[PDB]
Design a protein around this ligand. Structure first.
Ligand SMILES: OC[C@H]1O[C@H](O[C@H]2O[C@H](CO)[C@@H](O)[C@H](O)[C@H]2O)[C@H](O)[C@@H](O)[C@@H]1O
Ligand SMILES: OC[C@H]1O[C@@H](O)[C@H](O)[C@@H](O)[C@@H]1O
Ligand SMILES: OC[C@H]1O[C@@H](O)[C@H](O)[C@@H](O)[C@@H]1O
Ligand SMILES: [Mg+2]
Length: 580
């Protein structure tokens, strides 16, 4: 008896009418005294319906260009479905009924079956478009990943960016391709049996191109701020529906399988039904199998058990792994000792901080909650993602940090890809890519100069506004064919094949997972009715024989995979082995 608040009849923005009758244009404004739509250059006064709602139907079709005119000021549509001239230009009317989907036999993917592969469209290929990305799908399928996680696609200002400055949430960013090009990518992924997930940003709008306050200041509140402006006011139903309508678009109209919600701790809402809960209700009302994941640092199980999200990106594993391999202690890395005994505990508990004091200077509080309610798939683990590479001064990847060996890097992959938690890889990780992933942007005028200045002061650091910073982040695909890149890629292929094929590694129950350590050797044991597997990772500087590792059970004898392809059960510094 939950009823969606969305009815195509009353959809804000420009929606094609049935029977070839044209387009219905609708907006809400709390302050405008005159309201018109300018379509293909011609103004038409809109009809006032009450409640600040304005509507007009005209015989123009998909492809018509328009914007709204509020008290005489031409203003882009915040509900625009495409913005071919960028965030300050006219919108294009889009009809989602025209694309010829071929994915009727695709039925989504369960979280427990996801191995995510995080793609940034602009840097993933030379061209930096959906069409070019679609050509790498067979590679991804053969690699053994099962779900692509696409970085944000909402239109933002400038010709490149990570996506976190999205301002028109319903308009896929024009430099990556047209709406049909995005649909083509998702349809191609589904034909190969890959899921596709989208990163969405419901805690803030970018600094350029967000015109919602021009329509109604009450979309936003002065009670709290975001990074770029006034905070999003989730007590305002039109603000709630702006984001639930957007989530339904991506899932229903573009056939995405799920959404990764950025920075959920900053979606502030004191309503009776939290916006996260209403998001889950609204996407489930679609009657599919779509997933919602939260990027949330609070270690708060209620995201799953109360808001009814599917899982949580949980960085404690990442951070413990990074400190183990580098010893670094700056910023939030100071919250972790690292090491075999530390990693064993964090894996045991899912996340480390379950209410203990977080002693990081400037951030001190009691962090987290007991993780008992969550099952292995609810935790999304990684050793690399966009933030944990890009928020470093030089954007260097884990194997490129001082003091990290490729052997340690390969061991870390074996740990990540044999755990029952849901793993995520970042593009190029699988071949130990030689390129960094730097923070880049392309804002105009004073705002661009401020970004550059902001980056310099915060931490030579690459200027985010420089074209070179974007180009230096582009994947070099050819390099994967050789040397240690090819070696690393062979290991990733072997690990993803075992994850898929090995009947014991199919385990998805924390009940069947135990961990421990002996000195600098980490062990992770899985026991099910199908058998036993043990991963051992030598996080020391010396060589360790498997036979000399003190374990509280009898070690399995059969060597299933060694990260350096050795024949004997011995571990060089940083190396790992899976036995059974
Ligand atoms: O060598 C001085 C440091 O020793 C410890 O840190 C090392 O050992 C940790 C495991 O106990 C590793 O995770 C870490 O990467 C190493 O740097 C100690 O924790 C540090 O405070 C000392 O500076
Ligand atoms: O301006 C009148 C009203 O517009 C609305 O219908 C908003 O949803 C509401 O919160 C506001 O009070
Ligand atoms: O990505 C979110 C990060 O934000 C930091 O400010 C938090 O201290 C840390 O726990 C988290 O990893
Ligand atoms: Mg010992």
């Amino acid at each position: 008896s939950f009823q969606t608040q969305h009815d195509p009849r009353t959809r804000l923005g420009a929606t094609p009418l049935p029977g070839g009758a044209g387009t219905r244009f609708r907006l809400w404004t709390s302050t405008a005294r005159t309201v018109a739509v300018r379509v293909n250059g011609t103004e038409h006064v809109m009809t006032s319906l009450g409640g600040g709602i304005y509507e007009l139907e005209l015989p123009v079709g998909p492809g018509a260009r328009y914007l709204f005119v509020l008290d005489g000021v031409p203003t882009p549509d915040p509900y625009a479905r495409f913005l071919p001239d960028g965030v300050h230009g006219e919108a294009e009317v889009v009809d989602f009924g025209t694309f010829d989907w071929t994915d009727a036999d695709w039925h989504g993917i369960k979280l427990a079956d996801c191995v995510f592969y995080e793609v940034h469209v602009g840097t993933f290929t030379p061209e930096g478009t959906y069409r070019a990305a679609a050509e790498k799908l067979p590679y991804l399928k053969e690699l053994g990943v099962t779900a692509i996680q696409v970085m944000p696609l909402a239109a933002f200002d400038g010709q490149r960016g990570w996506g976190y400055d999205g301002a028109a949430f319903y308009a896929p960013y024009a430099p990556y391709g047209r709406p049909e090009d995005l649909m083509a990518l998702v349809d191609a992924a589904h034909r190969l049996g890959l899921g596709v997930f989208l990163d969405v940003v419901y805690n803030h709008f970018g600094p350029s191109g967000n015109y919602l306050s021009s329509y109604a200041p009450s979309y936003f509140t002065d009670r709290f701020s975001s990074a770029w402006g006034m905070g999003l006011d989730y007590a305002e139903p039109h603000m709630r529906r702006y984001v639930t309508g957007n989530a339904r678009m991506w899932l229903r109209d573009y056939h995405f399988d799920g959404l990764r919600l950025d920075a959920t701790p900053y979606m502030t809402d004191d309503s009776e039904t939290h916006i996260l809960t209403e998001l889950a209700q609204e996407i489930h009302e679609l009657g599919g199998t779509h997933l919602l994941l939260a990027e949330d640092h609070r270690n708060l199980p209620d995201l799953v058990t109360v808001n009814h999200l599917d899982g949580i990106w949980t960085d404690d594993f990442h951070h413990e792994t990074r400190v183990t391999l580098t010893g670094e202690q700056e910023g939030y890395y100071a919250g972790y000792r690292g090491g075999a005994e530390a990693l064993a505990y964090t894996i045991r508990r899912g996340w480390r901080y379950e209410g203990q004091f977080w002693a990081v200077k400037g951030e001190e509080h009691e962090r987290g909650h007991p993780s008992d309610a969550l099952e292995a798939p609810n935790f999304v683990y990684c050793i690399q993602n966009h933030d944990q590479i890009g928020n470093r001064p030089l954007g260097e990847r884990l194997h490129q940090s001082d003091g990290v060996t490729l052997h340690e890097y390969r061991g870390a992959a074996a740990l990540l890809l044999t755990l029952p938690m849901t793993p995520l890889l970042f593009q190029g990780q699988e071949w130990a890519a030689s390129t960094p992933f730097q923070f880049f942007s392309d804002h105009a005028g004073e705002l661009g100069q401020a970004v550059s200045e902001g980056r310099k002061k915060e931490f030579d650091v690459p200027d985010p506004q420089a074209e070179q910073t974007f180009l230096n982040s582009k994947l070099n695909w050819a390099e994967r064919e050789g040397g240690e890149h090819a070696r690393t890629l062979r290991l990733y292929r072997d690990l993803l094949r075992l994850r898929r094929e090995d009947p014991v590694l199919h385990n998805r129950q924390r009940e069947n997972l135990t961990t421990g350590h002996d000195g600098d050797v980490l062990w992770v044991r899985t026991v099910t009715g199908a058998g036993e597997r043990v991963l051992l990772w030598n996080l020391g500087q010396d060589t360790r024989a498997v036979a000399e590792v003190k374990l509280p059970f009898t070690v399995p004898r059969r060597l299933l995979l060694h990260t350096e392809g050795r024949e004997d059960l011995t571990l060089g510094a940083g190396e790992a082995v899976l036995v059974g």
